[PDB]
Ligand binder design. Structure first.
Ligand SMILES: Cc1cc([C@H](C)Nc2ccccc2)c2oc(N3CCOCC3)cc(=O)c2c1
Ligand SMILES: Cc1cc([C@H](C)Nc2ccccc2)c2oc(N3CCOCC3)cc(=O)c2c1
Lengths: 1001, 141
C-alpha cells in the first residue's frame, strides 16, 4: 500500500542526506543526488568512511551490499547496484551496510517478481493455510508443462511464443471483402534493408491473397533473381533451398508472419484488404531473428517440498451461530440486530432462515443452533453458507464454502471476518459475493460452530456416485424453442420439469445444457448424480455458449470441468485473446485456488506471450482489490516465474507506469493546482531528469507490445484541463521502417477515472463490427485500444488526425460540420468520404443505443479527416442514470442529429425525407436486427463481468436493460418498430423536427 | 407531494455519497498508515541493531584509548554514538505521532460506519414512500 519516492514525500529533493549505518558500528550521514546509482553511492561513502573512526576494520567496498526498509516495510537487500536512489522506493533515507551472506544472489534478485507483481513474495512464504501453499507448489507443474512445450523445436518454438502469428481464424473470406481484391489476388510491397546506407530496396508483387508467406518469399526471390536471366529449373531450386531461410515482418512494429497461414488470414493483411490500403512487409534474414531471442531458462524455487463418506451421515444440516465481536451503529437510532443465514448454490437451495431477534448491540451473542431443512447427503459439492448481521438493513456480510478444497466437510468452531456491503446493494444476504474471511482483521468478526461427527466427513468421488447414478436408473420435439432463448429469461416449473423429464433425449440438442442444468434440484442427491453422469459424456459445444457455464450461476465443479474441456478443444488463440477480459474476471467464482480453469489460462499465457502480456496486466489491474488480491497474487507469481525473459520487459513497463502514476499524483494533490504554464515547465523539466528519461524511454507499450515506445518527443507531451490531470504522451517509433506505419506512438495516460467501462464497451464495439462484417454490412467502427492497468489508472490509444465535433464546429451553423468535411475531401474523394461517415455513424448510433451509452455530446464524438466518426469516453455505461432518478425519465434529445443529417444528405436544405436518409436508416435497421440474432453472446459477456466492482454491472437487472434495448418478447418486425419508435422519440434520447423542445411553442 | 419526498430523497441520497466516499477514502489511509507503522517497526529494529554493534566493536578500542589517555579520540567515538541514539529517538517520536493518527482514524472511521448505517434504512423507506405517488403529469419534479 504506497506511491512514490519516499514515505510521505512524493518526490525527493535534488539532493538528500541519507544516514549510512556501517558495520563498524557508526553512522555516516552522506550527501547524495536523487539520481545517483547505488554503485556510485557505496563508492562515495567508502571514501568518507576513512574520515570516521574504526575506518581500518572495514573491508573493501566490493565485499559489501546495502539493505534498507522499503515502503511496504521489509528488509530489501539491494543486490542489483544499477538501481537509483529514487527508484529504490525507500521508507526513510538510510542505508545499512552488510556482508551479502544469504546467497543465491540470483534468486534473491527475484524481489522483482514482488515489484512487478504488486505484492512482495515474502508475504506468500509467511502464510499459514495449506491451500495457498499447496497451490504455489502444484501450480509449478503447469509451468514445466508450458516451458517444455515452447522449447521442443527450439529455434521455431521460441520465436512462436514471443511473436505468435496474429491470425484472424477461419481463412474463409466474406465475399464482400474478397471482391475488393481484384481477380482474387492482392498487391503487396516487400521491403529489404541492404548492407551500406540502410538502403531500403522495395520489390512490389501481385499475388494470390490465399497463398502462405513461404510463397510470398518465393515470389520475391523471382523478382530479384529473374531480372538476371535464368532457367525455370534454376529458380525452382533457388526457392527450394532458400524459400525458408527468410521470414516476413510487418513494417513498423514487431509482428511477424511465422506460420503457414493464408496471407489474407493474418490480421494485418485482412485489415489492409477491407480498409483498401496496401500492405508493406519487410523481408528479414530468418537467422537474425532467431539469434536475438535468448534462453528459455526456467528453474524452480524454495517452495517445492480415519474418515467417513458424506452419505453415511443421517441428519439435517445445522449450524450454531455463536457470537459476533462488534458492530458500528449507535444504540439509540435503531437497536435490533439479528444474523440472517441461508445455504446457497449461486441461487438458494434450502429454504433459508434468520436467528432470534435478541439484540444485545452491546454484546451480540446468540448461541442457538439454526436447524435448516436439508438432508446432509443431498448437499451438492458447491453448497455454501451465506450470511449477514442485519438491523431493524444488511450492515456486514460474508460467505463460507461448506467443503474444503480437499473435499472435506467443515467441522466445529471457526471465526469469519465479515465484509461491508457494496454501495448499491440493499438485498439483506449476498450470495454473488466472494467466499472467505475478510483479510482486514479490523472488521466485524462473527463466530460459528458446525457439527463434528464420529470422524472427518468427506464428499464422495466420481466412481461411487456413478454407482448410485446407475442404481437410481412431436410437439415436444419443438420445445427446443426453449434453447432458442436468452439466458436470463427464466423458465416456469413446467418448463423445468419438462426439460428434466426428457434429459436423455436432450443430449442430441447440446445447446440446451445451461437450461437443463438450471432444471436440476441441486438439493437432490439422485438428480445431481444422474446429471453428473450425463455431463461426463455430454457432446462438446461452441466456446461461446460453453463459457456461459463458467459464469457465476454454474458453480458446480463437474459443470465447469466440461466448460474448460470445451475451451481447450475449440476456442482459438485469437478468440481467447478476444474474450480474455471476461475469463479472468470469471475466476473470481471458483471456490478453490487450484481449478481446471486457472490451469488452462496459465498454460496459454506461457504458450503465447501475447496472451501472457494481457493475462498479466488484466490480473495486476485488480491487485489493489483485497477480494481477489490473494488469488490473483499467487497466480500472477506463477506467471512471473515461467515467463522467461518477458519479466525483464514487464518490469520495465511497470516501473514506467509507476513513474507516471506518481508524477500525476503530484499534479493532482500536491501544491500543483494552478496554471497550465507552471505545471508544463515543472512536468517538462522533471521529465528531463535521468531517472525519468530511463524509466520512460526504450520500453514496450502496454496497449500493445508490438509497438516499441522509443524516445519521448516531450515537446509534444501535455496535460488536459480536467482535474483528473490526464497526460498526452508522444514517443518515437524507433523501428528502421518507422515512417511506414506509425512514427508517432501517442498514448493518453490517466489517473482518477475507472477506465474499466471503456475497456468493456470498446470490446463489445469490436464484436459488433465482426458480426456486421461477417454478415455483409460494412459499418466501420473504431474500437481504439484502452487498458486499465490498475485502480483508476489506465491507458488510451490515440487516433491520429481525429477531431472532436466541437473543435470542428468552432454565429454557428449546422451545415458547418458538413461544409468542413467537404473541404477536407475535395471533389473526387467526396462521395467516398460521405459514405464512410454515413456507415460509421449508423454503426455507432445503433451501438450506443443498444448498450445505452450514457448521455453523449459534442466532445464525446470525434471525426477523422477522411470522414469516419467515432465515440470516446464511455464511462457511465448502460443506462445507470436510472439509479439517480429511479424512473423512466425524459432526457435530452441527441441534438447532433441535425449536424449529422446535413453531412448525410450532402448540403441538402431538407434532409429528413431524402433518398440518402433511407439508405442510412436502412443500415441501422440491418445492423440492429443483426445483433438481435447474436443477442445471447452479449448477455453472456456482460454476466461474466458481474464479479468486477463495476458499479453498472453489480446485478442481473442491470444486464436486463439489454433485453429492453433489443426485442425481448418481440419478433423481428415488432422489434424494428420498437427501435424506430424509440429513435423518432423526442425527449427520450431521440429526435423530431419540432425544434422547440426546452420551451414548447 | 413528490416535490416533498424528492427533497428528502436527494438529501439522504446525496449525503450517503459524501458519506460513502469518506468511508473508502479513509479506509485506504487506515491500511496505508498501518503498513507505515510496520515499516517504522523494522527501522527502529535495525537502528537498535546498529546501536548494539557499536557497543560490541567499540569495547576493546575504547579501553585501549582510556589507557593511553587519548580522550580526543574517545570523544569522536562517543560523538557518533550520540548521533546514533538521538536519531533513534526521532524515529520513535515520529512513530508515536503516526500511532495516534491511526488511533484517531480508528475513532472517526467507526463513526462514519455508524452514521452510514443510520442513513441506510431511512433512505430505504423514503424511496418506496415515493411509490405511493404513481397515481403528462411527470412535472412534480
Ligand atoms: C478527458 C479526455 C480527453 C480526451 C482528449 C481528446 N485528449 C486529451 C487528453 C489529455 C490531455 C489533452 C487532451 C480524450 O481523448 C480520447 N481519445 C483521444 C483520441 O483518440 C481516441 C481516444 C479518449 C478519451 O477518453 C479522452 C478523455
Ligand atoms: C444521423 C443520425 C440520426 C440519428 C437519428 C436521431 N436516429 C435515427 C436513426 C435511424 C432512424 C431513425 C432515427 C441518430 O441517433 C442517435 N441516437 C440513437 C438513440 O441513442 C442515442 C444515439 C445517434 C446518432 O448518432 C444518430 C445519427
Amino acid at each position: 500500500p504506497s506511491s512514490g519516492e519516499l514515505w510521505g514525500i512524493h518526490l525527493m529533493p535534488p539532493r538528500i542526506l541519507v544516514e549510512c549505518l556501517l558495520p563498524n558500528g557508526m553512522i555516516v550521514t552522506l550527501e547524495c543526488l536523487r539520481e545517483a546509482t547505488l554503485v556510485t553511492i557505496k563508492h562515495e561513502l567508502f571514501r568518507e568512511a576513512r574520515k570516521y573512526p574504526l575506518h581500518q576494520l572495514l573491508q573493501d567496498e566490493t565485499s559489501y551490499i546495502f539493505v534498507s526498509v522499503t515502503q511496504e516495510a521489509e528488509r530489501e537487500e539491494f543486490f542489483d547496484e544499477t538501481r537509483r536512489l529514487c527508484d529504490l522506493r525507500l521508507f526513510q533515507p538510510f542505508l545499512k551496510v552488510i556482508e551479502p551472506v544469504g546467497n543465491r544472489e540470483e534468486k534473491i534478485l527475484n524481489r522483482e517478481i514482488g515489484f512487478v507483481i504488486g505484492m512482495p513474495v515474502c508475504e506468500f512464504d509467511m502464510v499459514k493455510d495449506p491451500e495457498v501453499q499447496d497451490f504455489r507448489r502444484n501450480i509449478l507443474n503447469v509451468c514445466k508443462e508450458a516451458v517444455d512445450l515452447r522449447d521442443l523445436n527450439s529455434p521455431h518454438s521460441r520465436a512462436m511464443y514471443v511473436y505468435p502469428p496474429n491470425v484472424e481464424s477461419s481463412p474463409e473470406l466474406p465475399k464482400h471483402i474478397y471482391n475488393k481484391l481484384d481477380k482474387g489476388q492482392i498487391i503487396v510491397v516487400i521491403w529489404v534493408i541492404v548492407s551500406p546506407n540502410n538502403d531500403k530496396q522495395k520489390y512490389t508483387l501481385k499475388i494470390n491473397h490465399d497463398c502462405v508467406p513461404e510463397q510470398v518469399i518465393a515470389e520475391a526471390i523471382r523478382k530479384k533473381t529473374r531480372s538476371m536471366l535464368l532457367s525455370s529449373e534454376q529458380l525452382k531450386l533457388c526457392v527450394l533451398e532458400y524459400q525458408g531461410k527468410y521470414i516476413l515482418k510487418v513494417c513498423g512494429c514487431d509482428e511477424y508472419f511465422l506460420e503457414k497461414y493464408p496471407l489474407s488470414q493474418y490480421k494485418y493483411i485482412r485489415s489492409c484488404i477491407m480498409l483498401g490500403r496496401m500492405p508493406n512487409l519487410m523481408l528479414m534474414a530468418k537467422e537474425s531473428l532467431y539469434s536475438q531471442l535468448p534462453i528459455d531458462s526456467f528453474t524452480m524455487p524454495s517452495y517445492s517440498r480415519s474418515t467417513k463418506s458424506l452419505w453415511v451421515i443421517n441428519s439435517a444440516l445445522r449450524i450454531k451461530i455463536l457470537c459476533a465481536t462488534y458492530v458500528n451503529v449507535n444504540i439509540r437510532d435503531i437497536d435490533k440486530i439479528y444474523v440472517r443465514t441461508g445455504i446457497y448454490h449461486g441461487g438458494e437451495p434450502l429454504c433459508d432462515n434468520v436467528n432470534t431477534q435478541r439484540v444485545p448491540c452491546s454484546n451480540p451473542r446468540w448461541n442457538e443452533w439454526l436447524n435448516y431443512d436439508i438432508y446432509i447427503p443431498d448437499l451438492p459439492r458447491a453448497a455454501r453458507l451465506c450470511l449477514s448481521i442485519c438491523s431493524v438493513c444488511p450492515l456486514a456480510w460474508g460467505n463460507i464454502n461448506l467443503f474444503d478444497y480437499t473435499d472435506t466437510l467443515v467441522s466445529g468452531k471457526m471465526a469469519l471476518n465479515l465484509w461491508p456491503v457494496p454501495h448499491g446493494l440493499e438485498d439483506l444476504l449476498n450470495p454473488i459475493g466472494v467466499t472467505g474471511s475478510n483479510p482486514n482483521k479490523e472488521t466485524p468478526c462473527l463466530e460459528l460452530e458446525f457439527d463434528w461427527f464420529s470422524s472427518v466427513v468427506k464428499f464422495p468421488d466420481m466412481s461411487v456416485i456413478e454407482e448410485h447414478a446407475n442404481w437410481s436408473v412431436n410437439d415436444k420435439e419443438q420445445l427446443r424453442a426453449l434453447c432458442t432463448r436468452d439466458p436470463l429469461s427464466e423458465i416456469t416449473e413446467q418448463e423445468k420439469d419438462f426439460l428434466w423429464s426428457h434429459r436423455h433425449y436432450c443430449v442430441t440438442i447440446p445447446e440446451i445444457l445451461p437450461k437443463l442444468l438450471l432444471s436440476v434440484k441441486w438439493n437432490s442427491r439422485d438428480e445431481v448424480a444422474q446429471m453428473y453422469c450425463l455431463v461426463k459424456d455430454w457432446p462438446p459445444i461452441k466456446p461461446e455458449q460453453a463459457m456461459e457455464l463458467l459464469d457465476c450461476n454454474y458453480p458446480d465443479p463437474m459443470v465447469r470441468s466440461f466448460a474448460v474441456r470445451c475451451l481447450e478443444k475449440y476456442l482459438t488463440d485469437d478468440k481467447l485473446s478476444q474474450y480474455l477480459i471476461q475469463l479472468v474476471q470469471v475466476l473470481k467464482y471458483e471456490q478453490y485456488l487450484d481449478n481446471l480453469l486457472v490451469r488452462f489460462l496459465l498454460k496459454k499465457a506461457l504458450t503465447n506471450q501475447r496472451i501472457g502480456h494481457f493475462f498479466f496486466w488484466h490480473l495486476k489491474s485488480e491487485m489493489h482489490n483485497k477480494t481477489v488480491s490473494q488469488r490473483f497474487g499467487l497466480l500472477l507469481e506463477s506467471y512471473c516465474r515461467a515467463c522467461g525473459m518477458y519479466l525483464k520487459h514487464l518490469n520495465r513497463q511497470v516501473e514506467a507506469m509507476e513513474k507516471l502514476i506518481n508524477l500525476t499524483d503530484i499534479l493532482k494533490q500536491e501544491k500543483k493546482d494552478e496554471t497550465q504554464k507552471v505545471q508544463m515547465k515543472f512536468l517538462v523539466e522533471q521529465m528531463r531528469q535521468p531517472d525519468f528519461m530511463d524509466a520512460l524511454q526504450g520500453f514496450l507499450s502496454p496497449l500493445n507490445p508490438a509497438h516499441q515506445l522509443g524516445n519521448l518527443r516531450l515537446e509534444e507531451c501535455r496535460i488536459m484541463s480536467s482535474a483528473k490531470r490526464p497526460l498526452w504522451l508522444n514517443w518515437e517509433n524507433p523501428d528502421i521502417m518507422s515512417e511506414l506505419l506509425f512514427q508517432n506512438n501517442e498514448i493518453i495516460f490517466k489517473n482518477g477515472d475507472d477506465l474499466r467501462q471503456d475497456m468493456l464497451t470498446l470490446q463489445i464495439i469490436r464484436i459488433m463490427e465482426n458480426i456486421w462484417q461477417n454478415q455483409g454490412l460494412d459499418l466501420r467502427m473504431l474500437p481504439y485500444g484502452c487498458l486499465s492497468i490498475g485502480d483508476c489508472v489506465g491507458l488510451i490509444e490515440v487516433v491520429r488526425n481525429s477531431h472532436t465535433i466541437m473543435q470542428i464546429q468552432c454565429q454557428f451553423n449546422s451545415h458547418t460540420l458538413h461544409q468542413w468535411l467537404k473541404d477536407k475531401n475535395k471533389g473526387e474523394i467526396y462521395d467516398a468520404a460521405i459514405d464512410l461517415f454515413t456507415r460509421s455513424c449508423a454503426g455507432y448510433c445503433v451501438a450506443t443505443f443498444i448498450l445505452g451509452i450514457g448521455d453523449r455530446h459534442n466532445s464525446n464524438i470525434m471525426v477523422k479527416d477522411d470522414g469516419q466518426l467515432f465515440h470516446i469516453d464511455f464511462g457511465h455505461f448502460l443506462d445507470h442514470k436510472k439509479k439517480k432518478f429511479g424512473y423512466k425519465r425524459e432526457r435530452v434529445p441527441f441534438v447532433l442529429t441535425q449536424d449529422f443529417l446535413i453531412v448525410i444528405s450532402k448540403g441538402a436544405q431538407e434532409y429528413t425525407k431524402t433518398r440518402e436518409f433511407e439508405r442510412f436508416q436502412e443500415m441501422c435497421y440491418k445492423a440492429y436486427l443483426a445483433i438481435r440474432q447474436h443477442a445471447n453472446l452479449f448477455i453472456n459477456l456482460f454476466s461474466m463481468m458481474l464479479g468486477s466492482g463495476m458499479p453498472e454491472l453489480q446485478s442481473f437487472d442491470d444486464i436486463a436493460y439489454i433485453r429492453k434495448t433489443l426485442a425481448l418478447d418481440k419478433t423481428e418486425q415488432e422489434a424494428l418498430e420498437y427501435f424506430t419508435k424509440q429513435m423518432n422519440d423526442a425527449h427520450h434520447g431521440g429526435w423530431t423536427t419540432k425544434m422547440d423542445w426546452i420551451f414548447h411553442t | 407531494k413528490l416535490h416533498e419526498y424528492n427533497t428528502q430523497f436527494q438529501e439522504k441520497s446525496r449525503e450517503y455519497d459524501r458519506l460513502y466516499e469518506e468511508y473508502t477514502r479513509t479506509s485506504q489511509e487506515i491500511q496505508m498508515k498501518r503498513t507505515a507503522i510496520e515499516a517504522f517497526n523494522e527501522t527502529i529494529k535495525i537502528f537498535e541493531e546498529q546501536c548494539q554493534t557499536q557497543e560490541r566493536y567499540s569495547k576493546e578500542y575504547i579501553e585501549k584509548f582510556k589507557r593511553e589517555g587519548n580522550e580526543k579520540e574517545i570523544q569522536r567515538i562517543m560523538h557518533n554514538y550520540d548521533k546514533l541514539k538521538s536519531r533513534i529517538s526521532e524515529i520513535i517520536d515520529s512513530r508515536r505521532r503516526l500511532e495516534e493518527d491511526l488511533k484517531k482514524q480508528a475513532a472517526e472511521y467507526r463513526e462514519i460506519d455508524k452514521r452510514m448505517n443510520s442513513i441506510k434504512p431511512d433512505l430505504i423507506q423514503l424511496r418506496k414512500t415515493r411509490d405511493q405517488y404513481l397515481m403528462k403529469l411527470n412535472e412534480w419534479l
